[PDB]
Write an enzyme that holds these catalytic residues in place. Structure first.
Site: not given
Ligand code: GTP
Ligand code: GTP
Lengths: 105, 49, 438, 43, 427, 47, 47
Positions: C144, C254, C206, C140
Site C-alpha cells: 500500500g 556466498e 501468509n 510487500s
Molecule cells: N508482511 C506483512 N504483510 C502484511 C501484514 N498485514 C497485511 N499485510 C499485507 O501486505 C500488504 C501491505 O501493503 P499496503 O496495504 O499498501 O501497506 P503500506 O504500503 O505499508 O500502507 P497502506 O496502504 O496504508 O496499507 C497488504 O495489502 C496486506 O495484504 C503484515 O503484518 N506483515
C-alpha cells in the site's frame, strides 16, 4: 588530488566505505619548463589571448549488468537503454557506470 | 657462560619491564575514559532536569 | 566488519520488522531501556551487537535499521511502544500522506521529497558502518506504501551504490486471496522494475503460514505476532551465521554467488523444517533424517507450488545447533539417491550446507517449540512460474477491460509502461521453460 | 617495486613451459691406459 | 644447515596447521607457554630444521599464515597453540573471499601478494639454506586455490632450485558442497602441475570410512581428521629430524619417486590403525604391520589402486627394526603380487628405516604411493567439467571478473593430455 | 581422575557437551589507516 | 623509562587550562614579567 608514494595502503575506500570510485589518480609528471607567466590582472580574469575551460562545466534504466546470455535484440536495446543520457554520463560525482557481456550465435 | 648469561638477564629484566607497564598503561586509559564518560553523563541529565 | 542494514517499507513491513528486532533483543539480553546491566560490554560499539546495534560510549544499543512509512497512524504507537527509547527517533521515517495502494503515487507524487531525506539517513548510516555487506529490504508486493516507495529507493540506492548486495524480502501475493484488485497492477509493475536491479528477492505467502500452524503447531487461532514470530525466526536463522560461527561460516555473498543460476531469475524459496508444537516436540525425538524428510515434504513450503510440477536447481540448508558431519552427509546422500526429488540434470550438486553450534532459542510468551537442531531451506525450483502464470490470466483479463486506470492515468501515467511489464513477464515466463528445458 | 598484477588476459599455453631435452652426452670419457688384458689366444 | 619453512593457506590450511603444529610441539615436548622442557636430546638437536629460536628457550615456528576471513584466524589464535604463532606472521586481507577462485587469484591477491612475499622472504634470509617449502591447502578450497596459484607461480622464479612441496586435499567425490568447485579444481591443478614438484592427494570420504573401519567411534571431530593426517606429513619429516640408516632427502626421495616429470600426484600410506580392543589383541609384529600396511582398507588417499597397477612404492618405517625383516617383507609383497606392478620397472620399492619410534608406540611406519589409480580422479572431474561447460553455468560471475572461456579450453586440454599420459604409460 | 595429557594419538580424543553458549571476541579491527589487532583474552563462549 | 614509545602523556581529568604571560615587553625594552606566574590551568613553577 594526486596519489601518494609507497605507503599506498593507508588511503583507500577500505576506510571510506566508498561505493562510487573517488577520483582517478597517478604518480607521473612530465618535466615542466616554463617561467609560468601570469595571465590575469587581479580577479582570475584570463587575458583574452589565453584560453580556459571555455564554460564547459560552469557549475533508473542505467544499472550495472553483464550482457551474458540474454536474447540479442533485448540486449541491444539495453546498451541504448543504458546510454543516451548525458544527464547521467558526464559529471557531478561521475555519473558513469560500467558494462560487460558476450555476443550470441 | 658469562657472555651467555649476561644476555639472558639483560633481556628478561628488560622483558619483564616492557609488558607489565604496557599492561598497566592500557588499564589506566580505559578507567579514566570510563570515569570521564560517567562524569559527563551525570551533570548533563542533572542539567536536563 | 561483518554487518548489514535493514529497511522496512510498507505499513506491513513495519510490524514485522518490529517483531524481528523484538526477537533480536532477546538473545543478546537487551533490556528495553537500551543498556546492559552493570556488566561490562559497552564501548565504541563492538560486540555481538556491533553487526546489528550501535552501542557507543553513550551505552545505548542503536539498531541499524530504518522504518519508512507514509501514514502517521501505525508508526506512532510503535514510537510510543516498549522499545521506542531504543529506536532512533528520526530513523523511524513517517509520512502524512499515503500512496493509496498506488505504486506510481508513492513512486512519483511523494517519492521525490522523502527519498532525499532517507538517502541522508542511508549515508549517515553508511559513514558510521565499516564493512556493511548488504541491505535487508522488508517490503510487500501489494505494498500500500511498499510498492511505489520501495521501488524508487531501490533505484536510488542501486544507482549510487552498486558494488554491494541488496537483500529483498516481500510477502508474495496470495494466489487465490486478494485484499485488493489493484494489487496486480502494482505487483507486476514492481516485478518488472525490480528484475534488472534487485539482487536477491525472497518471497513468502501468509495462507500456507496459516496452513502450517493448525496442521502441526495445532493453533487454530494464531495472530500476526505468531506470523511475525515465524518469519522473524527465518531471518534470525539466516543471520545466525553472522551472529554465531560453526564448523564453517557462510555469508550472503556466498548465498548470491551459489544460489542464482543465471540472470533475471533470482527468486529462491525459504523453508524451516522443525515446525512443531511444544507438546509434540516434548514426547517425540528430532534427528537429521526425519527433518531432512520433513524439509523436502511438499506440504511444508509456504509457497503454493507443487515441487513435482517443477524441477529443482539449488537447495541451501543451514543447520543451526548441535549436529555432526556424519549423519548429515549420509542423510543428504540418501536424498541424492531419491527419485521423486528431481533436480535438473544440469546441476550435479546444488547443496550449500551451513553448520552453526548454537541451538535456536524460544521466545518468552512465544508459541514455537524448543529446538536443538534447526535448518533453513532456501531453494529455487521451476514450479514457481505457475504463480506468475496465475497472475497473467488474472492481469490479461483486467487490462483488456482496463479497470481503475482512470485513477492511474488520472494522476499522470500512460499505457505504454503497463505494456512493457507484460512482455517483460512474457520474457520471464518464456525464459522459465527455456531454462526449464534441459 | 610496484608488483604487476597479472591481468585476466592469458596464462601458460598447454604447459609448453618446461625443460625436457633428450640429448646425447658426447666428449666420451678419459683414457683407460690399461690395455686389453689378453692378447686373443696367440703366441 | 638445511632447513624448512612452512606455508599454510586456505581456511582448511588454517585448521590443519594448528593441528600440525601442536603435534610437533608435543612430540618435541614444549609446553603451551613455549619454554622447551629438555627430555630428548635428538629432538633438542634437530629442532632447527623447522624452528627458529626466540629468547627464553622459546621455539618460534617457521611458518606463514595467510587468509582473508578474520574469524578463522581468531579461532586459531584462541586455540591452545596460537601463542607460539606470531602476529608478524598473521597476514590477511580486508575482503571476504566469496569462495571464488577468480577474485582469489586476481583481485584480492593483488594487494596481499606483496605483503605475504615480504614475510616469507624475511624468513628466508632469517634461515640459512632451505631444502625448500611445503604448503598445506586444498585444491577445492577457494581462497587456498586463489593465493596458492599466485605464490607458487612466483616462488618458482625466485627459487627454482628448492622443494615446492604441496599438501592439498581432494573434495568428496559424491558431493563437493561448493558447486563451482570443479571449475576451481580444474583451474588450480592446471597451474599446479606447472608449478609444483610434489603433490599429496587426500580425500575426506576415506577418512569417514577409516573412522567407520578402525576408529569405530561413530562421531569424530574434524580436528581428529586433522589429527589423523597431521601424523602423516609428520612421519615423512621424521626422516629429516631423526637419525637412523635412512637417507631422508625428499630430493633423494623424489628422484626415487619421479621417473618422469609429469608425475606430481602421490598417495599417502600410514601404519598401525587400531580399534578399542585390538590394541591389546594385536601381536605387534612386522609381518602383521606389513600386512596391515598394504591393505586396500588401510588406503586413505583417493581410491583403491586395485583398479589399476603399481608404478612405484616407498614405505618409511619408524621404530626399532632390522634390515632382515624389511628385506624379506619386501620379497614377500614382491612375490605376493608380481604381476600387479608394471613391467616397465622391476624393484619399484624404496625403503627407509627410522630407528626413532614415536611417542606412545614403538612400531610404526609411513608410505607414499604412486599407482595407476588417479585416472578415476580426474576422469570423474572430466565429465563434471565437460558437463558444466556444455552450457557454461554460473559463468557470468567470472566474465565480470575478466575471465573468459578460452582459458578453460587449454585447462581441460591439459588434463585430457594427463589422462592419456597416465593411460599410455600403463596401458 | 582420568589420565590427563595421555597419549594424544591421532585417532581418538575426549568429548564434552556441558558447553551451552559459544560467543567469540572480535580481536581484529581496522579502525584507522593501520589495521590494528587486539590481544586474545576470551575464548569461544568467553573464558 | 622515557624511551620512545614509553611516553604516556598525562591525559586524565583536566578541567582548567588557563595560560598566563610569563614574558612581556614593558617600557621600551623586553623581559619576563613578574616571576610569580601559574602555568597551564594554574600550575606551580619549579620550586
Ligand atoms: N508482511 C506483512 N504483510 C502484511 C501484514 N498485514 C497485511 N499485510 C499485507 O501486505 C500488504 C501491505 O501493503 P499496503 O496495504 O499498501 O501497506 P503500506 O504500503 O505499508 O500502507 P497502506 O496502504 O496504508 O496499507 C497488504 O495489502 C496486506 O495484504 C503484515 O503484518 N506483515
Ligand atoms: N577448515 C575446514 N575446511 C573444510 C572442512 N570440511 C571441508 N573443508 C573444505 O576445505 C576447503 C579448504 O578451505 P580454503 O582453501 O581455506 O577455502 P576458501 O578459499 O577460503 O573458500 P571455500 O573453499 O569456499 O571455503 C574448503 O573449501 C572446504 O570446502 C572442515 O571441516 N574444516
Amino acid at each position: 588530488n594526486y596519489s601518494a608514494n609507497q605507503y599506498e595502503k593507508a588511503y583507500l575506500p577500505t576506510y571510506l566505505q566508498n561505493w562510487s570510485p573517488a577520483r582517478p589518480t597517478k604518480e607521473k609528471i612530465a618535466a615542466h619548463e616554463g617561467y609560468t607567466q601570469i595571465i590575469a590582472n587581479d580577479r582570475g580574469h584570463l587575458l583574452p589571448s589565453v584560453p580556459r575551460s571555455k564554460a564547459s562545466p560552469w557549475g533508473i534504466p542505467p544499472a550495472k549488468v553483464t550482457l551474458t546470455a540474454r536474447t540479442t535484440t533485448a540486449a541491444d536495446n539495453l546498451t541504448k537503454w543504458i546510454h543516451k543520457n548525458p544527464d547521467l554520463l558526464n559529471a557531478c560525482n561521475g555519473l558513469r557506470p560500467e558494462i560487460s557481456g558476450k555476443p550470441f550465435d | 657462560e658469562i657472555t651467555d648469561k649476561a644476555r639472558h638477564e639483560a633481556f628478561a629484566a628488560e622483558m619483564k619491564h616492557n609488558d607489565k607497564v604496557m599492561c598497566m598503561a592500557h588499564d589506566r586509559e580505559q578507567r579514566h575514559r570510563k570515569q570521564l564518560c560517567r562524569a559527563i553523563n551525570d551533570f548533563q541529565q542533572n542539567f536536563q532536569k | 566488519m561483518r554487518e548489514c542494514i535493514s529497511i522496512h517499507v510498507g505499513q506491513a513491513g513495519v510490524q514485522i520488522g518490529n517483531a524481528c528486532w523484538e526477537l533480536y533483543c532477546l538473545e543478546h539480553g537487551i533490556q528495553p531501556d537500551g543498556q546492559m546491566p552493570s556488566d561490562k560490554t559497552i564501548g565504541g560499539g563492538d560486540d555481538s551487537f556491533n553487526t546489528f546495534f550501535s552501542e557507543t560510549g553513550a551505552g545505548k544499543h542503536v539498531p541499524r535499521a530504518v522504518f519508512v512509512d507514509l501514514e502517521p497512524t501505525v508508526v506512532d504507537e510503535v514510537r510510543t511502544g516498549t522499545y521506542r527509547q531504543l529506536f532512533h527517533p528520526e530513523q523511524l521515517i513517517t509520512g502524512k500522506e499515503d500512496a493509496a495502494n498506488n505504486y506510481a503515487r508513492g513512486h512519483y507524487t511523494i517519492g521525490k521529497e522523502i527519498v532525499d531525506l532517507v538517502l541522508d539517513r542511508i549515508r549517515k548510516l553508511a559513514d558510521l558502518c565499516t564493512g556493511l555487506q548488504g541491505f535487508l529490504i522488508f517490503h510487500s508486493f501489494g505494498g500500500g506504501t511498499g510498492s511505489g516507495f520501495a521501488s524508487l529507493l531501490m533505484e536510488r540506492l542501486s544507482v549510487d551504490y552498486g558494488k554491494k548486495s541488496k537483500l529483498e524480502f516481500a510477502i508474495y501475493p496470495a494466489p487465490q486471496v486478494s485484499t485488493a484488485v489493484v494489487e496486480p497492477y502494482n505487483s507486476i509493475l514492481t516485478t518488472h522494475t525490480t528484475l534488472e536491479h534487485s539482487d536477491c528477492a525472497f518471497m513468502v505467502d501468509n495462507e500456507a503460514i496459516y496452513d502450517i500452524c493448525r496442521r502441526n503447531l495445532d493453533i487454530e487461532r494464531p495472530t500476526y505476532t505468531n506470523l511475525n514470530r515465524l518469519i522473524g525466526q527465518i531471518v534470525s536463522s539466516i543471520t545466525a551465521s553472522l551472529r554465531f560461527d560453526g564448523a564453517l561460516n557462510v555469508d550472503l555473498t556466498e548465498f548470491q554467488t551459489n544460489l542464482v543460476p543465471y540472470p533475471r531469475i533470482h527468486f529462491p524459496l525459504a523453508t524451516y523444517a522443525p515446525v512443531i508444537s511444544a507438546e509434540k516436540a516434548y514426547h517425540e525425538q528430532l534427528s537429521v533424517a526425519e527433518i531432512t524428510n520433513a524439509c523436502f515434504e511438499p506440504a511444508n513450503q509456504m509457497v503454493k507450488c507443487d515441487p513435482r510440477h517443477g524441477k529443482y536447481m539449488a537447495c541451501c540448508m543451514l543447520y543451526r545447533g548441535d549436529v555432526v558431519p556424519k549423519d548429515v552427509n549420509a542423510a543428504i546422500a540418501t536424498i541424492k539417491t531419491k527419485r521423486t526429488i528431481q533436480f535438473v540434470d544440469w546441476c550435479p550438486t546444488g547443496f550449500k550446507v551451513g553448520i552453526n553450534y548454537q541451538p535456536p532459542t524460544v521466545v518468552p510468551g512465544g508459541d514455537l517449540a524448543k529446538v536443538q537442531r534447526a535448518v533453513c531451506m532456501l531453494s529455487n525450483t521451476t514450479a514457481i512460474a505457475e504463480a506468475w502464470a496465475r497472475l497473467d490470466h488474472k492481469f490479461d483479463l483486467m487490462y483488456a477491460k482496463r479497470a481503475f486506470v482512470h485513477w492511474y492515468v488520472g494522476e499522470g501515467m500512460e499505457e505504454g509502461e503497463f505494456s512493457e511489464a507484460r512482455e517483460d513477464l512474457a520474457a520471464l515466463e518464456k525464459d522459465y521453460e527455456e531454462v526449464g528445458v534441459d | 617495486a610496484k608488483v604487476e598484477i597479472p591481468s585476466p588476459k592469458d596464462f601458460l599455453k598447454k604447459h609448453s613451459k618446461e625443460k625436457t631435452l633428450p640429448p646425447k652426452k658426447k666428449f666420451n670419457r678419459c683414457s683407460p691406459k690399461k690395455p686389453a688384458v689378453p692378447l686373443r689366444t696367440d703366441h | 644447515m638445511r632447513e624448512i619453512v612452512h606455508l599454510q593457506a586456505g581456511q582448511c590450511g588454517n585448521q590443519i596447521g594448528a593441528k600440525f603444529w601442536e603435534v610437533i610441539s608435543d612430540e618435541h615436548g614444549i609446553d603451551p607457554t613455549g619454554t622447551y622442557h629438555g627430555d630428548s636430546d635428538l629432538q633438542l638437536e634437530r629442532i632447527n630444521v623447522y624452528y627458529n629460536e626466540a629468547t627464553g628457550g622459546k621455539y618460534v615456528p617457521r611458518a606463514v599464515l595467510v587468509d582473508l576471513e578474520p574469524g578463522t584466524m581468531d579461532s586459531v589464535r584462541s586455540g591452545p597453540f596460537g601463542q607460539i604463532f606470531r602476529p608478524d606472521n598473521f597476514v590477511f586481507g580486508q575482503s571476504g573471499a566469496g569462495n571464488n577462485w577468480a577474485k582469489g587469484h586476481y583481485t584480492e591477491g593483488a594487494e596481499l601478494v606483496d605483503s605475504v612475499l615480504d614475510v616469507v622472504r624475511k624468513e628466508a634470509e632469517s634461515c640459512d639454506c632451505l631444502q625448500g617449502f611445503q604448503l598445506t591447502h586444498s585444491l577445492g578450497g577457494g581462497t587456498g586455490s586463489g593465493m596458492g596459484t599466485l605464490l607458487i607461480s612466483k616462488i618458482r622464479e625466485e627459487y627454482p632450485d628448492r622443494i615446492m612441496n604441496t599438501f592439498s586435499v581432494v573434495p568428496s567425490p559424491k558431493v563437493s558442497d561448493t558447486v563451482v568447485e570443479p571449475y576451481n579444481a580444474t583451474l588450480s591443478v592446471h597451474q599446479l602441475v606447472e608449478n609444483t614438484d610434489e603433490t599429496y592427494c587426500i580425500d575426506n570420504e576415506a577418512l569417514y570410512d577409516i573412522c567407520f573401519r578402525t576408529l569405530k567411534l561413530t562421531t569424530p571431530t574434524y580436528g581428529d581428521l586433522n589429527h589423523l593426517v597431521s601424523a602423516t606429513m609428520s612421519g615423512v619429516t621424521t626422516c629429516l629430524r631423526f637419525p637412523g640408516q635412512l637417507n631422508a632427502d625428499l630430493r633423494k626421495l623424489a628422484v626415487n619417486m619421479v621417473p618422469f616429470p609429469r608425475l606430481h600426484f602421490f598417495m599417502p600410506g600410514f601404519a598401525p590403525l587400531t580399534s578399542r580392543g585390538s590394541q591389546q589383541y594385536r601381536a605387534l609384529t612386522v609381518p602383521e604391520l606389513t600386512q596391515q600396511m598394504f591393505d586396500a582398507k588401510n588406503m586413505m588417499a583417493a581410491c583403491d589402486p586395485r583398479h589399476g597397477r603399481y608404478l612405484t612404492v616407498a614405505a618409511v618405517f619408524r621404530g626399532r627394526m632390522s634390515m632382515k625383516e624389511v628385506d624379506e617383507q619386501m620379497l614377500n609383497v614382491q612375490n605376493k603380487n608380481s604381476s600387479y606392478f608394471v613391467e616397465w620397472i622391476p624393484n619399484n620399492v624404496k625403503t627407509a628405516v627410522c630407528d626413532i619410534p614415536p611417542r606412545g608406540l614403538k612400531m610404526s611406519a609411513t608410505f607414499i604411493g604412486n599407482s595407476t589409480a588417479i585416472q578415476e580422479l580426474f576422469k570423474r572431474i572430466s565429465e563434471q567439467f565437460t558437463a558444466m561447460f556444455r552450457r557454461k553455468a554460473f559463468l557470468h560471475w567470472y566474465t565480470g571478473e575478466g575471465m573468459d572461456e578460452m582459458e578453460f579450453t587449454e585447462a581441460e586440454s591439459n588434463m585430457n593430455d594427463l589422462v592419456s599420459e597416465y593411460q599410455q604409460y600403463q596401458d | 581422575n582420568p589420565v590427563h595429557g595421555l597419549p594424544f594419538l591421532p585417532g581418538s580424543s575426549f568429548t564434552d557437551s556441558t558447553k551451552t553458549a559459544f560467543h567469540r571476541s572480535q580481536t581484529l579491527n581496522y579502525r584507522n589507516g593501520y589495521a590494528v589487532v587486539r590481544r586474545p583474552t576470551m575464548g569461544i563462549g568467553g573464558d | 623509562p622515557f624511551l620512545p614509545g614509553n611516553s604516556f602523556n598525562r591525559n586524565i581529568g583536566k578541567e582548567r587550562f588557563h595560560k598566563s604571560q610569563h614574558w612581556g615587553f614593558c617600557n621600551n625594552v623586553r623581559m619576563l614579567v613578574s616571576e610569580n606566574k601559574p602555568g597551564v590551568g594554574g600550575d606551580l613553577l619549579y620550586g
